Structure 1
Amino acid sequence: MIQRTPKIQVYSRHPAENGKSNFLNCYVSGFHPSDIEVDLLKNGERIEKVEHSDLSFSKDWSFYLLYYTEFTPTEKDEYACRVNHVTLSQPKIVKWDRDM
């Protein structure tokens, strides 16, 4: 069976302004099979009650999902997305960089 590893983007809905409420997004795309596990992390720890979109797919049949949570960025707080998938030997962590 064919397997496709997720592309992973971690980013905010609006340009980040310290002390201003925003949304932290993790967009996973281009993957197959559809089984995937995604956590959003604040300072290395899992954020509770993260929401996600309903499973949908692109023209090439590969899947995409958006995981999101409300957050208020600061200078010190580090955010990341952690993804597990059959294509990964270990969970992949992608750090939030407010310039990406």
Structure 2
Amino acid sequence: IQRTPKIQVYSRHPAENGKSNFLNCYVSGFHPSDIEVDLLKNGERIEKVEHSDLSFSKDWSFYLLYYTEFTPTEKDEYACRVNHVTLSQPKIVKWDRDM
């Protein structure tokens, strides 16, 4: 019995083009704990990505926050790429500044 990650991609602060911010990818509700998470800038893996320490919810599912400093622009596309045992292929969730 495994649980697939929920994924939210969002910024720490309301996005403002040209203003430094943090791009977050919050993965939660998953089990087991191994998970591959990349933050992507225009399809390319961002090198400077950190994540929170593994923790879990009352239902024992895990959650992690992956995050990187970023300066959003109009053109630059950001995404979070998640792989987990429950996924046949990496799930890419695009950063939507309104969600």
TM-score normalised by length of structure 1: 0.98
Q: Distance in 2 between matches of 1:82 and 1:74?
A: 20
* Shift of residue 17, structure 1, vs aligned partner: 0.4
Q: Distance in 2 between matches of 1:18 and 1:32?
A: 36
Alpha-carbon deviations, 1:23-57, whole Å to 9, x = none? 00000000000010000000000000200000000
Residue 37 of structure 2: aligned partner: 38
Runs (5+) with no aligned partner, structure 1: none
Q: Equivalent pairs: percent with the same residue?
A: 100
Q: Secondary structure at the match of 1:41?
A: strand
List 4+ stretches of structure 1 deviating above 4 A: none
Q: CA RMSD in A?
A: 0.4
* Shift of residue 3, structure 1, vs aligned partner: 0.3
Residue 88 of structure 1: aligned partner: 87
Q: Distance in 2 between matches of 1:68 and 1:51?
A: 5
Residue 70 of structure 1: aligned partner: 69
TM-score normalised by length of structure 2: 0.99
